[PDB]
Design a protein around this nucleic acid. Sequence first.
DNA 1: TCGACGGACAAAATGTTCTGTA
DNA 2: TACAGAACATTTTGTCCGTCGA
Lengths: 12, 321, 321
Amino acid sequence: EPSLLKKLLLAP
Amino acid sequence: PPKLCLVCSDEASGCHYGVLTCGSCKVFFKRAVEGQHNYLCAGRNDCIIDKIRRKNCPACRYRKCLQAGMNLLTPTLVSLLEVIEPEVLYAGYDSSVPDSTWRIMTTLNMLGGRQMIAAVKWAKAIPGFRNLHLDDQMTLLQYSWMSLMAFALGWRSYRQSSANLLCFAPDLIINEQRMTLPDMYDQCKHMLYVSSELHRLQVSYEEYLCMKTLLLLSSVPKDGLKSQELFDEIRMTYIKELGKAIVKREGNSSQNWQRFYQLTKLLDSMHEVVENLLNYCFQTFLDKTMSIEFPEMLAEIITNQIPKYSNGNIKKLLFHQ
Amino acid sequence: PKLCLVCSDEASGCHYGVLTCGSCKVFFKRAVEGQHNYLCAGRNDCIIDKIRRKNCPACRYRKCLQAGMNLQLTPTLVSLLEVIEPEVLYAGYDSSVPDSTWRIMTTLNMLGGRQMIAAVKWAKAIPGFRNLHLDDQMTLLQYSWMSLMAFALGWRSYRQSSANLLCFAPDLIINEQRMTLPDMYDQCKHMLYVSSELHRLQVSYEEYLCMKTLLLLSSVPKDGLKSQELFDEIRMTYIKELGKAIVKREGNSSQNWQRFYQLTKLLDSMHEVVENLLNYCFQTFLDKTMSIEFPEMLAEIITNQIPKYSNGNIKKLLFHQ
DNA sequence: TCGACGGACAAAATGTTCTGTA
DNA sequence: TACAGAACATTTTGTCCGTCGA
Ligand SMILES: C[C@@H]1C[C@H]2[C@@H]3C[C@H](F)C4=CC(=O)C=C[C@]4(C)[C@@]3(F)[C@@H](O)C[C@]2(C)[C@@]1(OC(=O)c1ccco1)C(=O)SCF
Ligand SMILES: C[C@@H]1C[C@H]2[C@@H]3C[C@H](F)C4=CC(=O)C=C[C@]4(C)[C@@]3(F)[C@@H](O)C[C@]2(C)[C@@]1(OC(=O)c1ccco1)C(=O)SCF
Ligand SMILES: [Zn+2]
Ligand SMILES: [Zn+2]
Ligand SMILES: [Zn+2]
Ligand SMILES: [Zn+2]
């Protein structure tokens, strides 16, 4: 956890 | 002082077909109209029509004829959408090897996974998107991913040929003979609706980029989003921006409203396209006996989406009712 | 089938180190010998295909270098269907007075009633149909009337022109421009599907004659017909007859096979095209606000039909699934 | 023998001038 | 004076078919 989408979303 | 052709900007001869055009654009128009010509654009429906490049795109020259009205630095929101538009990916397909239904679908699922990794980057670059809540940002990408990828597939397939073919990647194009075999006839009919509609409508690059952004803002949760008021403002910003693209495309055509009707009617029909594509996707994913592979990126989305479409936890946003 | 590595046209040889066709060979030789400071109206990535290779000489020359260039009466069953084919009826429309949404829809209803007069007579003359019981005859025409008229409309439009038209009568053709207005938009999308597929498939007249017959035999009662055993031999015979027409086209067993698949998929998709044309016909018939007039011939069928769709009393036949 | 040059011819696409008519 | 279609014309592309080299 979390999803790879969540991980990729907050990754600046 | 030299009066210029409103089509190619070459010394005009007079007021030909209502517009102050030069002798050459005047005869080009009369030929293209009565020659009932089917001109296909090699670019993205917005080639520069000037004295040197008027011979280049006749599809665009006939559009700049109609946008003039013939008959018998400061970056704009859409200029940003162009700049953030993702680079086209390769399937890495071994085309010099025998093909399979499983092999093509697995390859395509893997390509769609890379496309999602790109569409998330593209999404963050949309002014306003990173301004919504994270649970909304994820929901928008989860709801509109097939919509995004199929709309982009339609553009890639539109651009690649006038023939019915699905240009998934430069190295994975499925020709009409292959898409009509029973193994993939029905799935290809939905993906082909997009490229044929973009074709019919002569959708310009500006109109396309705006519609693609609106596809990201086309579906919301049944009980709304967390930053719903901001979402509505952003959605309405890009509808105003699509209208600006239609004004640029039509120019003096008078059919700006009619154009908007058709493009928004297409934006609406994308829900039906996606609903069909998703049904094959979920069905295949859950079918263990098929044993087709799906990437970790997509399989997480699909698994966290299947019990949401069935539970009516989606509010499909439509322009037309 | 060697492909030109520049425009994908059938290659003629290995010209200037690259497998290219005749045209790209001489274009390349000209683009280096001539000073040719070619300009791109697009974004320097225009698609170079056989039809659009003339378009961007800058991208074509760019692509050339990127590739590597450098220096007995016996009547047939089908011929009976051809002879029994009814002659095209005129709408009785007057282009003289202005166009109207009421005038168009109502004139088409009157034309459809007159066309239903010939639809019944044409059915009587079908080898085998005259053998069926009177209520199976009257019911088969009731279940599949919209199927016949829409398929014949699709056929008339396909034969009329390569353009997106709807050819209801020789004196009443609704061009693309007119059917994209909201009053006609959604319903015309379904009427146009038929001609869209007839063009795509290049359907022959003998293929059309068998297909139109298979459409009259495409919808039976959910509790079966009275002359059901007889019905199954007639239907089977016309399926075989369709295959005879497909053979008269190419002759390659796999080509012939996929052609049958595609044509049967078309006959199948017709149930969905009828489904959507009935929905708008029933909405305009039951709406007192509408005022669109239906002739006594068509109104009689519509009154009988609406409670049959509400009671699921129909067993739509499908070649696939 | 085979296959690719390139000129000669040809076709297609585009442009200019001429002439009829308000 | 003007603009529209025709007449003439130019430019750009594409085909045929020898000749000739490996
Ligand atoms: C019908 C589904 C939908 C397919 C996806 C459509 C999407 F537009 C897309 C575009 C691409 O450029 C690459 C991949 C996807 C994301 C997609 F094509 C693939 O995942 C495969 C999907 C799910 C789908 O495709 C087919 O049947 C299909 C396409 C060509 C032949 O068969 C599948 O369900 S395959 C198993 F999921
Ligand atoms: C949607 C309905 C269906 C239309 C008929 C379809 C049929 F195939 C047909 C073919 C013809 O060659 C001539 C007439 C009919 C029988 C038909 F076109 C008409 O009567 C009109 C029908 C009922 C229909 O069409 C339209 O929406 C329509 C056609 C043009 C614009 O809208 C109507 O319901 S008209 C409302 F009465
Ligand atoms: Zn001009
Ligand atoms: Zn163009
Ligand atoms: Zn070529
Ligand atoms: Zn170009």
